[PDB]
Amino acid sequence: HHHHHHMVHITLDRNTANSWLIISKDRRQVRMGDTHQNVSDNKERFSNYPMVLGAQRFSSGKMYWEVDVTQKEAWDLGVCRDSVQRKGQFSLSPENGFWTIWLWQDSYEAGTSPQTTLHIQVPPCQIGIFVDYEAGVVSFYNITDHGSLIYTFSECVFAGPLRPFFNVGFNYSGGNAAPLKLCPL
Numbered sequence: 001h002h003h004h005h006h007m008v009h010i011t012l013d014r015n016t017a018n019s020w021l022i023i024s025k026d027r028r029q030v031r032m033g034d035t036h037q038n039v040s041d042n043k044e045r046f047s048n049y050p051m052v053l054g055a056q057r058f059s060s061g062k063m064y065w066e067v068d069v070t071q072k073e074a075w076d077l078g079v080c081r082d083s084v085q086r087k088g089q090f091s092l093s094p095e096n097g098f099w100t101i102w103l104w105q106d107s108y109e110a111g112t113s114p115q116t117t118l119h120i121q122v123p124p125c126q127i128g129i130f131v132d133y134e135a136g137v138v139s140f141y142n143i144t145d146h147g148s149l150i151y152t153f154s155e156c157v158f159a160g161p162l163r164p165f166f167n168v169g170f171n172y173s174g175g176n177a178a179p180l181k182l183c184p185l
């Protein structure tokens with residue numbers, strides 16, 4: 001891919017974060033805390049899962065960013081509608097306004113309904129996420145493996161403004177405490 005030149009500076013939106021998340025001062029890193037992080041509840045916060053949005057909203061153009069997933073056991077990454085449900089239980093699917101991939105239990109899957117098995121030869125330490133709003137495309141790249149394609153969602157029905165989407169995952173095992181980090185351009 002030659003997509004790096006649509007590079008955007010993503011920051012995390014503290015107001016949207018699950019109340020157990022800890023976002024760094026520079027708003028570029030997020031991890032699961034071992035407890036509630038002493039913030040007020042609000043209608044934006046994801047209640048059921050360790051999720052947070054980027055502050056940026058996109059309704060046109062091409063956008064690219066990279067995320068560090070080093071030493072994590074579980075995570076979700078991609079984009080979502082600004083209007084996605086925040087409270088209660090829901091599945092990550094394009095019908096619910098999410099275009100995502102994830103890791104759990106040593107398998108990588110795309111968030112279709114039902115989910116799609118991914119074939120990755122080199123487990124990624126950094127993921128590139130490319131959005132072409134006009135084309136209706138969300139693509140994922142393996143930065144650890146020379147930028148090799150992971151998955152492409154096409155004919156996407158964005159149906160509104162998009163936000164970068166993150167899930168640091170639970171840490172039941174004690175092996176998933178590491179942060180997600182937005183990587184420098």
Ligand SMILES: Cc1cc(N2CCCCC2)nc(CO)n1
Nearest residue numbers: 103104105106107108109115117
């Ligand atoms: C804990 C878990 C894992 C899982 N997978 C998806 C298929 C590939 C393997 C991982 N699915 C579920 C569904 O409740 N739970």
